[PDB]
């Protein structure tokens, strides 16, 4: 539940938000897309599993973790995206083609949105293009994200949190530097005003020899979190792999329905055929001789048409969309 | 298609940092001087000048390569084996035998020797590529000869193998805006271009 430097926040410009998209995956054959952000979904303040609410990074100086509900998150590329699942950093959703992806938490009027470019296209399987998996059709081998939230496409390494500095922790008065930690908290301070000097202060503390607040830094001693190895955060020196969390929604194999193209009408002439064709959508015709040359030909077809294909005594084979191969022999 | 991991940056903001050598795939790293990066407080350093930064990046297989991945094969002399059904007199038999003129097929009272083929043939070129059951007669580069933006830009003995070798032609650029970040540019996944 850290924050990343999203390149496109709500208004127009980059800024540091809890909802930064860091990577996006769309290899699933149904068009479902997996996303990863800095927020922890399905989790309350302490991290206990609960789907109805999520925790995320706060916009304050004590900078705690604050929570919201599933109703208030929306995702969209061109039209709104429908959520399919969420665990921690990761999301899975199905939604129409577009050029960029956006995730928005709508806390009332506080609608915070992060957008990142990703050219997502309507992708199909089989040899016939289609908007929609048909009700009737061949069941062909496809690979689709598993909606099971306890799966694992892999694993991701996270580390101890890095620096998190503040100048609200610092205070300037009469050209002099003080540190004001939050109540009851031991905050680690470090400065250089000539000599470089460090320390930890738990209360309102003076420093000497310092006139500019830019020369000193303060930050809470937080190791109670694990943060992904993100490039938007300056890191801890001990960046050892301090954990490994699974990548839910594994890309599992299954079977998908694909349509059955038009059954062609063959019109034959001496050592050659004239095949009459109908395909409202892009349909792939692949032909090949069966001799010492294949002479393989391929074509994506829309509308209706007619194709003249010479057939020799040795024979010819063709596949029209997802239909089965058909083989012929001239006389 | 490779996943470009860009580790979290590092700053020694009035000391010095140098370029260490790792064993990661197409490992790239470089050093900048005065940068003075901001993260959320508007300043993450003291001694704003002479502010060395270590910027790094490398690549791995994607977590989804477990399904979508191509494997490169060198084929050799094509051994041909035939299943055969015969009938003689009244009795019939099924048997599977090689065509070499050496290997005999047998059915329990019958012996037969088959081959060699009258005219040898193999539809497979010496260099082939397999992806999800689809075969291509593609001349893939030899192992270790990765080329950026070309097929086989990323190579490894196996998906779980740790000897990931790559030359993706990545180069890391100097940061410009005051906010902390790592800018870089990378060549397109040659796997995707071949796809």
């Amino acid at each position: 539940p850290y924050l990343g430097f999203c390149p496109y926040c709500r208004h127009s410009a980059p800024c540091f938000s809890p909802i930064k998209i860091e990577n996006v995956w769309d290899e699933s054959d149904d068009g479902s897309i997996r996303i990863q952000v800095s927020a922890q979904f399905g989790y309350n303040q302490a991290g206990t599993a609960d789907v109805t609410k999520f925790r995320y990074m706060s916009f304050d100086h004590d900078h705690d973790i604050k929570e919201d509900s599933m109703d208030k998150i929306a995702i969209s590329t061109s039209g709104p995206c429908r959520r399919l699942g969420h665990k921690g950093y990761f999301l899975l959703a199905q939604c129409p083609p577009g050029d960029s992806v956006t995730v928005s938490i709508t806390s009332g009027a506080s609608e915070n949105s992060c957008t990142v470019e990703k050219k997502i296209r309507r992708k199909f399987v089989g040899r016939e293009e289609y908007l929609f998996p048909p009700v009737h059709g061949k069941l062909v081998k496809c690979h689709v994200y598993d909606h099971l939230k306890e799966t694992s496409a892999g694993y991701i390494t996270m580390h101890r949190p890095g620096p998190h500095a503040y100048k609200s922790y610092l205070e300037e008065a009469s050209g002099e530097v003080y540190i004001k930690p939050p109540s009851g908290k031991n905050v680690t301070y470090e400065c250089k005003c000539g000599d470089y000097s460090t320390g930890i202060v738990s209360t309102r503390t003076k420093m000497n020899g310092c006139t500019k607040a830019k020369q000193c830094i303060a930050y809470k001693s937080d190791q109670t979190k694990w943060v992904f190895n993100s490039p938007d955060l300056i890191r801890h020196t001990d960046h050892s792999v301090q954990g490994k969390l699974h990548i839910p929604f594994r890309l599992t194999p299954t079977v998908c329905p694909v349509p059955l193209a038009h059954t062609p009408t063959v019109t034959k002439w001496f050592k050659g055929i004239t095949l009459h064709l109908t395909a409202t959508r892009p349909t792939l015709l692949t032909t090949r001789k069966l001799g010492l040359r294949a002479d393989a030909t391929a074509e994506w077809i829309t509308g209706t048409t007619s194709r003249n294909f010479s057939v020799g005594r040795e024979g010819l084979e063709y596949v029209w969309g997802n239909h089965e191969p058909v083989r012929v022999w001239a006389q | 298609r490779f996943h470009t991991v860009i580790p979290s940056p590092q700053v020694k903001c009035c000391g010095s940092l140098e370029c260490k050598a790792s064993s990661k795939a197409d490992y790239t790293c470089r050093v900048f001087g005065g940068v003075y990066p901001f993260m959320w407080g508007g300043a993450q350093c003291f001694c704003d000048s002479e502010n060395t930064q270590l910027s790094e990046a490398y690549v791995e297989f994607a977590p989804d390569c477990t399904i979508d991945h191509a494997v490169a094969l060198k084929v050799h002399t094509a051994a041909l084996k035939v299943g055969l059904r015969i009938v003689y007199g009244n009795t019939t038999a099924h048997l599977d035998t090689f065509v070499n003129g050496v290997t005999p097929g047998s059915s329990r009272d019958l012996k037969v020797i088959a081959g060699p083929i009258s005219a040898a043939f193999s539809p497979f070129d010496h260099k082939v590529v397999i992806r999800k059951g689809l075969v291509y007669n593609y001349d893939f580069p030899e192992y270790g000869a990765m080329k950026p933006g070309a097929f086989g830009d990323i190579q490894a003995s196996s998906l779980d193998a740790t000897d990931i070798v790559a030359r993706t032609d990545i180069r890391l650029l100097k940061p410009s805006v005051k906010n902390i970040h790592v800018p870089y540019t990378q060549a397109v996944s040659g796997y995707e271009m071949w796809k």
């Epitope: 620096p163 680690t188 470090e190 050892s240 | -």
Partner: antibody
Framework: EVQLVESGGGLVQPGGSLRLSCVAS????????MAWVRQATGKGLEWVST?????????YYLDPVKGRFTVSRDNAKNTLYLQMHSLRAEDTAVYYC????????????????WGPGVLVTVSS | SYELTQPPSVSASPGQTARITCGGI??????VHWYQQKPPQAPVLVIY???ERPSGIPERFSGSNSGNTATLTISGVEAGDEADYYC????????????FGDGTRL
Amino acid sequence: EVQLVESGGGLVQPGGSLRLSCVASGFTFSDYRMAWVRQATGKGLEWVSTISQPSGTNTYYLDPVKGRFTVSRDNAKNTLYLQMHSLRAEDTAVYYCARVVTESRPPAAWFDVWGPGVLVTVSS
Amino acid sequence: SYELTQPPSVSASPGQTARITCGGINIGSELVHWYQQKPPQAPVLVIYANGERPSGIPERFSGSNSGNTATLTISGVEAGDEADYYCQLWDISSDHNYIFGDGTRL
């Protein structure tokens, strides 16, 4: 070559005084913090004092050695110094001058270069 | 003031791995450094910042830190490893003091 060489140790009566010296070579003496560390015979390492860089404005000492021992530096001749007053019997030990390599974040300091050390004895 | 405890001795023939533990309250929240010493020679740093090493340290040496325990792990012990080892840290909230461990012998 980076080298630290101590000198000035020896025998002294309790309540006496001494000036231990450490000449430095092979590096920029002004660029690094220095420290005096101590080891009694058969015992572990115990930190004595640290002097900052380049001017050594702020100096830190172990609790019993405050007020009696004072660490100083000279960047011109590249020399660290520790003056001891009111010496006591258990001050008897081998003292090493050691560089301090410190990193701004997380505040963490360690000793990369150590001198061979020199023996001071406090006995009657 | 943090207190560091290590076992007074650890016994290991050559060939296997040896673990030496530094104990102290909440030391996993700080960065530990292990120094190796052969008396009368000066101590040499072998681990710093819980996870890395100076140049020239063989690949067998490794360090870890978590909670109430830090650990120096030395795979494939040899005769030359027989030495003394000090845990150390820099507690700065106690006036920039450098606490060393009691020491352990291999």
